[PDB]
């Protein structure tokens, strides 16, 4: 199940974490995650085990032992845990919580405690790690984005438009671009002054995309740095050219008549390694696989009883 070269994971309000075989739609294994909805899923760089950020815990089921239950649970934090992220070298894990803290966990040791804590006023929705492993980008509900230098412990903060909750941020693998998406449904793009190694690492504003009228729920860059994907409460995943920042492909699930009252938000996405395909999480209980170029619905992974809020997607050798 971590032995298949393609790990595809789905989580939601239905107390399971389901694993799928990408190319078929067959659900492989399914895992018990009770007493909470899953907020975020992320497969560890090591491909050994997957993390499930939820209500006041991060349970972590194993991809190699192909069977058991959580190897590691992390506790002692109140209010939700919104984002997870790992540092390339095996042992570090980051989290944004409703408790207004970004936290760094030593995976290679004991303690329900965490190695570090970074307080903010206002809950943290998303946390991601600059590819250089040196800085952690933190977005909160006030509309502030914090760059946390993991060396200098210097915090530096940036608000775009906000008096508006920034919902997710992400940063292209090539470290050229950073993107923040907020509850207005805007998408901000910054250029990266690659300071690094004896660092500066500045951000130069490039564009605001009027991506959506409704909440924008997540944003993500293709591994290529070619494309920017934006998921939203308008039941849509919009894929943007990084050359143009114009709309390339729109994936959506909006009925076919004004009187259907929605059914489903586009909660998340993950690109494929070759950036050819995109996975989609939705409140209509499905994950979906799309052709990024045609916007074809190349598959529909059905199983969850209740809504789907997370994906994880892995293509490593």
């Amino acid at each position: 199940v971590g032995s298949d070269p393609v790990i595809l994971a789905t989580a939601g309000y239905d107390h399971t974490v389901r694993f799928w075989q990408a190319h078929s739609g067959i659900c492989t294994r399914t895992v018990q995650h009770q007493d909470s909805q899953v907020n975020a899923l992320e497969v560890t760089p090591d491909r050994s085990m997957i993390a499930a950020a939820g209500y006041q815990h991060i349970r972590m089921y194993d991809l190699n032992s192909n069977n058991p239950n959580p190897i590691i649970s992390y506790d002692g934090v109140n209010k939700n845990i919104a984002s997870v992220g790992f540092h390339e070298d095996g042992r570090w894990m980051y989290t944004g919580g409703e408790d207004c803290t970004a936290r760094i966990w030593d995976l290679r040791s004991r303690n329900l405690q965490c190695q570090r804590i970074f307080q903010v006023n206002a809950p943290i929705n998303c946390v991601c790690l600059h590819p250089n492993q040196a800085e952690l980008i933190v977005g909160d509900q006030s509309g502030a984005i914090h760059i946390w230098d993991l060396k200098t412990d210097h915090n530096e903060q940036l608000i775009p438009e906000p008096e508006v909750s920034i919902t997710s941020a992400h940063i292209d693998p090539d470290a050229s671009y950073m993107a923040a998406v907020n509850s207005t449904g805007n998408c901000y793009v910054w250029n990266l002054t690659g300071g690094i190694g004896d660092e500066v690492t500045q951000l130069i504003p490039k564009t605001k995309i009027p991506a959506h009228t409704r909440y924008a729920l997540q944003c993500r860059f293709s591994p290529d740095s070619t494309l920017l994907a934006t998921c939203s409460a308008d039941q849509t995943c919009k894929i943007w050219r990084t050359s143009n920042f114009s709309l390339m492909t729109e994936l959506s699930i909006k009925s076919g008549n004004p009187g259907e009252s929605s059914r489903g938000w586009m909660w998340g996405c993950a690109f494929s390694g070759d950036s050819q395909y995109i996975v989609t999480a939705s409140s209509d209980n499905l994950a979906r696989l799309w052709c990024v170029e045609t916007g074809e619905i190349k598959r529909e992974y059905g199983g969850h009883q209740k809504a789907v809020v997370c994906l994880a997607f892995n293509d490593s050798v």
Binding site: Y13, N39, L217, S261, K306, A307
Partner: protein, 1058 residues
């Protein structure tokens, strides 16, 4: 026939709206403002226009919008913009002109008419005539009037009207006589031509008919020299009385101008100018005063003002302050006063006493402004304090009476005390210090006290604030003889009446440890005892049964003093209250709560020392022996078990066993199971079992609770109804009903275990807010009021609440509708759980979806729909809605300042006869509900989806928001009275307990709450730094009260989807 015409309309609006429900078209939008207008519902329709703007910028040209929004001043500058950018465009000019004729800008209206006379447009030629006739009428130029009248057709009411004026100037009264009777008939027939769907031309016909009847008196003023006082009286009275917006009075005066020049009217035009300043048309107000001065728009700006007419100058000076130039304004005042006192002291040759007096009274007003303005320009500090105090005392001198003068002086003195106290807390934050502090505070306290006393006497009927203030000083000043002397002088001086307003506050300090303070209180209360007892017994009775010795001691003393006096009243009231507290929680009910508590401490907490404290008062309670049949029936079936269950507990006390203790709980759980069974059986109480004494009571001298007030003959407890329905609830409250000595019956809620003393002061606040709303003319225009209750506390546990008729809880009305229409009551709830079983723990983002999901698959109607089906007609449906929208808004704002939380669907209700809404349960006050740990309210007041729905379509734009600012404006104006009351029970010694619940000294906590409140009353409630004006703050509140993010967070019971 006339009452039957609006019925046709109301019932058409109902559908016209229900149509707009299905799809907002500019078509409907047009026929909605129209029909709402015939229905002479102007402000509701004005809401419709707001929606017109914020969706279709599509009768276009922002100047045409500013014109329909009667905002001529905005439309004029927007029409200039649109004329200079574009070309001539004959219609742009017409609008540009209408803006002038409403603004009374005759100078520009006449010029704009002549200067542009190509006007190849012939309709443009026709409309042109009417305006440029009145324009020339305001500019004297009668030739110009005649020319432009010779172009107005004699068929129009307007054509016939302006002929009447031209004749009356050129003295042709037989012509003028006939022109009026024709203009009447040309307007009579015109009011049936546009038989409803007209402008404020049905309201402005009353402007023309007024002018026509006045213009017939102008005829009377030419021929008969002996109505020159009769006519001027009716002219003058039908003015202070009359209320017609600025614009109409211009015209009305212009009629009177044909006969009396402004310099003979003066008071008339100063009164008019006065109004132009309050409504905020200063540029106009000015031009009136410049004429009355007959001296420059003080273009010679560095020069002194002319003292020729002291009254007119004073107007100008404040018009100056209200205008931009206000350091300048302040200057001219200092000097103007100096010129005035010299114009008195010398120029008063004896045989001129009236001039002297009016001159001293004008000065007192000047001195008040001087103090007022000085404060505004400088603030409060060591340099202003003496000056304004001097300014005010000076004002006191020249008027002696005058509430305002004596008030201002006291408040200044009282803020001097505050300024220094609050400075010294600053000093102590970082012996000769205290000795100068005490000399300081003593120096300003005594006059403060003194001031408030003379101010109170001059109010009488309207002084709650001042009265409360006297108390702050009285209680706060742990009594230094100086202050005590001044108080005891005052107490003697001022009427007893006064203190009734304040009885709860006084009794809150019955047991003041400070000796010099207590004495006076007791004395005062006993004198309040002498005249109007009744106003005293109930409140004293509560106190006389108080765990705290001091309280019930000193309470009894006053009652004793009242027996040498009204003994059998003290005696009756004594027993009626006792018995009602027995009836409130029956013996077994107390055992039922006391057994639950004791099992939580023992079996759930290992607390036997807490447990013993729970049961022993219930054991000692019965130790007295049964006294009513119900107490004996209980005693038989449970007494023996319980008395021996305590036996085993008291064997354990000494043996320290656990097998001794386990025999007791064996017996204890036995009776619990017995009682629990019989509890849902309690659905009625009969007096003859429960309290016999109360059944016996016939024709008492005691007054029916909360009915006593002077003015009104005393209504007494003539008999108590034999049965009490027990409303089945968590606190099974009884529905007690009394028979009145006037005939009519009086119903009450007899509550068991809720400290009703808070809700009491809350009523007090509402009382005041009602007075304020009655006194603001706009609020009075719209009948705006709060529903208050009669809250008669009985103990810390119990009390009586006045029963309001014709009401069902919001929850009820819905529960019924849903069951009638076959909808599952809690459907939004079930839907939400079906979607997300873990709803309570979702991220905000996640919740908002689940919430929206529920909302989108359920009817938003119900309340709107059930209120239509209820209605017996359609006009009755319509006015019940007008009443609803307004009453709901009033409490929205009031509730906000009060910080009134917990507004779930069972805590508010709707009077099914008037349509008005009413709130119950005022426990969760101040931010409390939002500060709590579990499930914190984010809502400022329930402005929920079915409440919105039930209003007019275009609701929040219409009557709701309008009524919002109005209420809020009244509140901010009277921010001090409102705060007097609030401080009164934040710092109330017996009520601070509701702020140590932030856990589940207080000095600092109480400070916050009040600051929080002031912030709300000054528009600082949001951004610390901004000072938001009303409509902004209002808009902000609605926004917040409406946000899905806020609502999806509400505790589910609150029903954020209702």
């Amino acid at each position: 026939e006339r009452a039957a015409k609006c019925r046709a309309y109301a019932k058409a609006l109902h559908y016209k709206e229900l149509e707009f429900q299905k799809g907002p078209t500019p078509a409907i939008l047009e026929s909605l403002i129209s029909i709402n207008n015939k229905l002479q519902q102007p402000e509701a329709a004005a809401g419709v226009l707001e929606y017109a703007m914020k969706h279709f910028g599509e009768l276009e040209i922002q100047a045409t919008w500013y014109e329909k929004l009667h905002e001529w001043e905005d439309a004029l500058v927007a029409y200039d913009k649109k004329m200079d950018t574009n070309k001539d465009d004959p219609e742009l000019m017409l609008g540009r002109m209408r803006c002038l004729e409403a603004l009374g800008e005759w100078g520009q209206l006449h010029q704009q008419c002549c200067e542009k006379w190509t006007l190849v447009n012939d309709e443009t030629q026709a409309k042109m005539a009417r305006m440029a006739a009145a324009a020339a009428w305001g500019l004297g130029q009668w030739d110009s009037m005649e020319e432009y009248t010779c172009m107005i057709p004699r068929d129009t009411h307007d054509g016939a009207f302006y002929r009447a004026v031209l004749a009356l100037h050129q003295d042709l009264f037989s012509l003028a006589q006939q022109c009026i009777d024709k203009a009447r008939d040309l307007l009579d027939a015109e009011l049936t031509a546009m038989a409803g769907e007209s402008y404020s031309r049905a309201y402005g016909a009353m402007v023309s008919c007024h002018m026509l009847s006045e213009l017939e008196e102008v005829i009377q003023y030419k021929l008969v020299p002996e109505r020159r006082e009769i006519i001027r009286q009716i002219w003058w009275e039908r003015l202070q009385g009359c209320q017609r917006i600025v614009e109409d009075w211009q015209k009305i005066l212009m009629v009177r101008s044909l006969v009396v020049s402004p310099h003979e009217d003066m008071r008339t035009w100063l009164k008019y100018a006065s109004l132009c300043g309050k409504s905020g048309r200063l540029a106009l107000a000015h031009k009136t005063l410049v004429l009355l001065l007959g001296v420059d728009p003080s273009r010679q700006l560095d020069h002194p003002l002319p003292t020729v007419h002291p009254q007119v100058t004073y107007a100008y000076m404040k018009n100056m302050w209200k205008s931009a130039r206000k350091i300048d304004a302040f200057q001219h005042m200092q000097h103007f006063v100096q010129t005035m006192q010299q114009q008195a002291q010398h120029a008063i040759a004896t045989e001129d006493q009236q001039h002297k007096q009016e001159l001293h009274k004008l000065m007192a007003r000047c001195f008040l402004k001087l103090g007022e303005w000085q404060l505004n320009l400088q603030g409060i500090n060591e340099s202003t304090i003496p000056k304004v105090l001097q300014y005010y005392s000076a004002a006191t001198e020249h008027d002696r009476s005058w509430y305002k003068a004596w008030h201002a002086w006291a408040v200044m003195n009282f803020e001097a005390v505050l300024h220094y106290k609050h400075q010294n807390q600053a000093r102590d934050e970082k012996k000769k210090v205290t000795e100068d502090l005490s000399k300081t505070l003593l120096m300003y306290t005594v006059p403060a006290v003194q001031g408030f006393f003379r101010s109170i006497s001059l109010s009488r009927g309207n002084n709650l604030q001042d009265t409360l203030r006297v108390l702050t000083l009285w209680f706060d000043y742990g009594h230094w003889p100086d202050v005590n002397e001044a108080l005891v002088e005052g107490v003697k001086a001022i009427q007893i009446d006064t203190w009734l307003q304040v009885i709860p506050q006084l009794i809150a300090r019955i047991d003041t440890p400070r000796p010099l303070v207590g004495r006076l209180i007791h004395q005062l209360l006993t004198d309040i005892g002498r005249y109007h007892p009744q106003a005293l017994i109930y409140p004293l009775t509560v106190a006389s049964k108080s765990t705290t010795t001091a309280r019930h001691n000193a309470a009894n003393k006053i009652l004793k003093n009242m027996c040498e006096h009204s003994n059998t009243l003290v005696q009756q009231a004594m027993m009626v209250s006792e018995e009602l507290i027995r009836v409130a929680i029956l013996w077994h009910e107390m055992w039922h709560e006391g057994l639950e508590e004791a099992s939580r401490l023992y079996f759930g907490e290992r607390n036997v020392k807490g447990m013993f404290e729970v049961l022993e008062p219930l054991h000692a309670m019965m130790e007295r022996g049964p006294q009513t049949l119900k107490e004996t029936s209980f005693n038989q079936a449970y007494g023996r078990d319980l008395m021996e269950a305590q036996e085993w507990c008291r064997k354990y006390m000494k043996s320290g066993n656990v097998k001794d203790l386990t025999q007791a709980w064996d017996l204890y759980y036995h009776v619990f199971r017995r009682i629990s069974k019989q509890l849902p059986q309690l659905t009625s109480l009969e007096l003859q079992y429960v309290s016999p004494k109360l059944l016996m009571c016939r024709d008492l001298e005691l007054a029916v609770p909360g009915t006593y007030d002077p003015n009104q003959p005393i209504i007494r407890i003539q008999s108590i109804a034999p049965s009490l329905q027990v409303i089945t609830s968590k606190q099974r409250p009884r529905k007690l009903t009394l028979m009145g000595s006037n005939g009519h019956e009086f119903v009450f809620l007899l509550k068991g275990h809720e400290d009703l003393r808070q809700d009491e002061r809350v009523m007090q606040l509402f009382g005041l807010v009602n007075t304020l709303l009655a006194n603001d003319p706009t609020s009075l225009r719209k009948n705006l009021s709060i529903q208050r209750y009669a809250v008669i506390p009985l103990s810390t546990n119990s009390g009586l609440i006045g029963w309001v008729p014709h009401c069902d809880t919001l929850h009820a009305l819905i529960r019924d509708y849903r069951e009638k229409k076959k909808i599952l009551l809690n459907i939004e709830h079930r839907i939400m759980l079906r979607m997300a079983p873990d709803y309570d723990h979702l991220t905000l983002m996640q919740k908002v979806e689940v919430f929206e999901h529920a909302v989108n698959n359920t009817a938003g109607d119900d309340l709107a729909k059930l209120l239509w089906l209820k209605s017996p007609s359609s006009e009755v449906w319509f006015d019940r809605r007008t009443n609803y929208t307004r009453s709901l808004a009033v409490m929205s704002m009031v509730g906000y300042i009060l910080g009134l939380g917990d507004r779930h669907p069972s805590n508010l209700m709707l009077d099914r006869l008037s349509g008005k809404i009413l709130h119950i349960d005022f426990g969760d006050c101040f931010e409390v509900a939002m500060t709590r740990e579990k499930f914190p309210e984010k809502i400022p007041f329930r402005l929920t989806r079915m409440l919105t729905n039930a209003m007019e379509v275009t609701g929040l734009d219409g009557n709701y928001r309008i009524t919002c600012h109005t209420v809020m404006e009244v509140l901010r104006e009277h921010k001090d009275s409102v705060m007097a009351v609030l401080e009164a029970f934040v710092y109330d010694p017996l009520l601070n307990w509701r702020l140590m619940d932030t856990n589940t000294a207080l000095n600092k906590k109480a400070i916050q709450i009040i600051n929080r409140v002031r912030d709300k009353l000054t528009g600082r409630d949001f951004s610390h730094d901004d000072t938001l004006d009303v409509p902004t703050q209002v808009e902000l509140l609605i926004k917040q009260a409406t946000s899905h993010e806020n609502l999806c967070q509400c505790y589910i019971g609150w029903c954020p989807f209702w």
